[PDB]
């Protein structure tokens, strides 16, 4: 069985600093090259990683991590509690402009430090000694060992980071990592090579020696390379199949199709006219024919989304039907008319220019062209399209330099709030819409203190209801992962949240 794995990651990562990464491309790499206090096992549950033992206080708020004996970076240096402390505080430092700082707000003092209302010293992550990390949360958080497996909670080599502020931007002596693989090459916009890391504590269970990740943003070509034997995988999570090929691949029985905790949505910049008008947002959302899109455009067995939280998330199964009606043109026309009245306008032709944006990808263009048609036919609303390379695109949305913007969101841990708290705060890193609601916030925060699971769930549903009512985003569909593979590739870890770990993968 061969020991090299050839896959497409489509495009240049946003960042291979674990504290700046906020995307599937970045995460696809880092998830191979770093390891947190915990990692995800085959059954999608957290288990011990860099921490050999985890202790939680009686009150549930204080976690004490014992750092495994002998764990090392890829240059041989020990991994220490200090490395974690530094990483986490680095991500929270507002100067470093992590879009995922809010992911660390579960730690006491984290939000204050990040917002400028408090000292980084008072963030309650503490390297007590080299082998002991002590963490105090604002509230008992039963998924915290999921968060510590998430890439924002990765350690970085403190010594090298302090020496070279740009360590993360190139492969080389200054790029070191603690995961089952290490990155031995990175040609920007070309590819990345990972190799088994001989310093990783659990290296005896790692079978691959090399992973070549190419950067082909062309779905057709990915499948050709796969059909030629030059890739061992074609499609998601890291690549993509061309939509016209899914008929065939379903018919020959090769295609894998899996529902995942993820949502495809069109984000509105609620601070840019005319998307600042809630009525216009609703008219654009309600006038969508999502069943058409998932049957006729994407053809990947996606489920129409009329909600934020995927119905895989237990307690939220009835988001299958969602908060409103799909292809509800009557209601959309009502909203349009109301919003038109508020502007002193009679006809939708006289709205200001609207540009709908997405990241370069034939699949996203096909969806955008369908939606553009829906708006023209159903509302009389003209929109012009544009596309950008992924990493630039992420900054375009984060900086609100857009009106409507395609985005997709996969769960970072198995809790419904991951689909909600990204909109808690106006300048949240992953919000992008400029929206916030006081009641929405209050309920989110109340959910984090509620000890009964069903009552908590109701708070989140309430919150979701307010969200959908103000429509800062337009839900389109809940995700699937579709791919074909060399069926000799065994042991790949793919949890319901739609990521992939190659740590224990092999060819038989």
């Amino acid at each position: 069985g061969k020991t090299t794995l050839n896959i497409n990651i489509k495009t240049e990562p946003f960042s291979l600093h674990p504290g700046l990464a906020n995307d599937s491309v970045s995460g696809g790499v880092i998830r191979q090259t770093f390891e947190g206090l915990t990692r995800i096992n085959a059954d999608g549950e957290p288990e011990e990683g860099m921490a050999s033992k985890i202790e939680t206080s009686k009150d549930g708020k204080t976690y004490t991590f014992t750092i495994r004996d002998g764990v090392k970076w890829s240059n041989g240096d020990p991994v220490t509690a200090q490395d974690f402390e530094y990483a986490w505080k680095w991500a929270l430092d507002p100067n470093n402009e992590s879009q995922y700082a809010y992911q660390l707000y579960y730690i006491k003092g984290a939000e204050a430090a990040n917002t400028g209302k408090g000292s980084l010293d008072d963030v309650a992550v503490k390297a007590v000694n080299d082998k002991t990390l002590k963490v105090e949360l604002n509230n008992p958080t039963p998924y915290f060992t999921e968060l510590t497996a998430f890439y924002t909670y990765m350690p970085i080599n403190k010594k090298i980071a302090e020496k070279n502020k740009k360590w993360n931007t190139n492969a080389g002596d200054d790029y070191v990592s603690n995961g089952p693989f290490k990155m031995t090459a990175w040609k920007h916009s070309g590819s990345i090579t990972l190799e088994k890391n001989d310093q990783y504590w659990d290296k005896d269970k790692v079978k691959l020696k090399k992973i070549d990740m190419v950067m082909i943003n062309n779905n057709n070509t990915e499948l050709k390379k796969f059909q030629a034997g030059e890739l061992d995988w074609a499609g998601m999570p890291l690549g993509q199949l061309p939509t016209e090929s899914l008929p065939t691949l379903k018919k020959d029985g090769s295609l894998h199709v899996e529902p995942i905790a993820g949502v495809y949505w069109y984000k509105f910049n609620t601070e840019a006219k005319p998307l600042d008008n809630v009525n216009i947002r609703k008219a654009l959302t309600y006038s969508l024919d999502r069943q058409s899109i998932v049957k006729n455009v994407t053809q990947g067995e996606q489920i129409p989304a009329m909600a934020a939280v995927p119905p895989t998330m237990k307690g939220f199964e009835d988001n299958k039907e969602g908060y409103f009606k799909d292809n509800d043109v009557k209601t959309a026309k009502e909203y349009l008319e109301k919003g038109l009245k508020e502007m002193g306008l009679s006809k939708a032709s006289d709205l200001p220019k609207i540009k709908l944006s997405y990241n370069t990808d034939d699949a996203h263009a096909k969806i955008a062209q369908a939606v553009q048609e829906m708006w023209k036919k159903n509302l009389g609303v003209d929109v012009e399209l544009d596309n950008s390379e992924w990493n630039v695109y992420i900054d375009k949305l984060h900086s609100q330099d857009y009106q409507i913007g395609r985005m997709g969101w996969l769960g970072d841990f198995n809790d419904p709030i991951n689909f909600l708290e990204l909109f808690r705060d106006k300048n949240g890193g992953n919000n992008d819409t400029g929206w916030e609601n006081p009641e929405f916030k209050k309920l989110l925060n109340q959910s984090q203190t509620e000890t009964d699971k069903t009552k908590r769930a109701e708070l989140l549903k309430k919150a979701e209801g307010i969200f959908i009512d103000e429509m800062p985003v337009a839900p389109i569909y809940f995700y699937t992962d579709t791919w074909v593979q060399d069926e000799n590739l065994k042991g790949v870890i793919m949890p319901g949240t739609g990521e992939v770990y190659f740590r224990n993968a092999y060819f038989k």
């Binding site: 599937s24 491309v25 995460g27 993509q240 993820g262 997709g408």
Partner: peptide, 5 residues
């Protein structure tokens, strides 16, 4: 996380 696909 933001999904490219």
């Amino acid at each position: 996380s933001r999904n490219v696909t």
